[PDB]
Ligand SMILES: Clc1nc(N2CCOCC2)c2ccccc2n1
């Protein structure tokens with residue numbers, strides 16, 4: 001257990017910042033994740049051999065889609081790492097173990113299509129799971145991989161710690177369903193403002209962990225503008241494919257997803273920062289003040305999209 005992962009100096013320092021980009025070298029992403037587990041959790045949280053086999057099985061079960069890919073998995077885990085590191089004493093040992101694994105697993109076997117597209121297609125997964133269709137699948141895929149031989153990174157936990165962590169992971173992965181985000185944040189807003197928010201109340205923690213999951217999941221909008229902008233193209237490449245597939249089912253897609261209406265992208269990103277991103281990091285910053293850099297970066301990027309619209313730069 002005397003075997004640290006270390007990172008080159010520039011990464012060793014930048015990985016601690018919310019806005020860290022994990023880079024274009026895929027073969028370093030596993031080592032970045034282990035590094036984060038070792039500092040966030042301990043070098044003892046997981047048997048390294050089991051962790052490495054688990055990481056590589058998770059990687060293998062992410063597909064080669066423009067956005068909802070292995071890089072998104074590690075990026076979202078890194079944002080959670082930064083939240084946990086900036087809020088040291090607020091989370092249990094089980095929560096630190098669970099949430100980085102939840103983040104790495106949260107989009108397992110994603111095909112680049114929304115819950116909506118599965119329902120209009122009449123995909124079998126839409127029959128098996130009527131709401132949070134892809135997210136119940138992602139959790140399903142996580143449990144499958146935990147059950148491959150040699151892959152039970154939790155095997156040293158007690159029976160009841162095992163149940164607690166898998167339950168943290170399931171809520172955390174379900175919370176990445178943006179349809180559940182709006183009510184979750186509204187509730188957290190009221191509880192914070194009326195002063196009823198209580199982190200010893202498990203159902204309140206669940207809510208707070210769900211909003212962190214949304215914050216980590218959307219964290220593309222909290223990068224430096226050049227990362228945010230280039231990622232938006234991957235995001236839109238999936239939307240346009242979905243739009244195409246909607247048109248093949250005989251359904252005019254929403255204009256966000258229509259590759260004939262690319263002109264409307266900047267105004268669509270404005271709606272998204274205003275309806276989703278800014279509210280998310282605002283309430284998150286209210287509950288966890290050290291996460292403010294996420295809100296500040298998100299505001300900077302809103303202002304960068306306003307500049308794209310005012311023709312003061314292009315896409
Ligand atoms: Cl319009 C839009 N949707 C996003 N997400 C909604 C659907 O799940 C996938 C991602 C998004 C996520 C991050 C950054 C900008 C984004 N912009």
Ligand SMILES: [Mg+2]
Pocket residue numbers: 106107134176177
């Ligand atoms: Mg998802």
Ligand SMILES: [Zn+2]
Pocket residue numbers: 072076106107176217
């Ligand atoms: Zn995601």
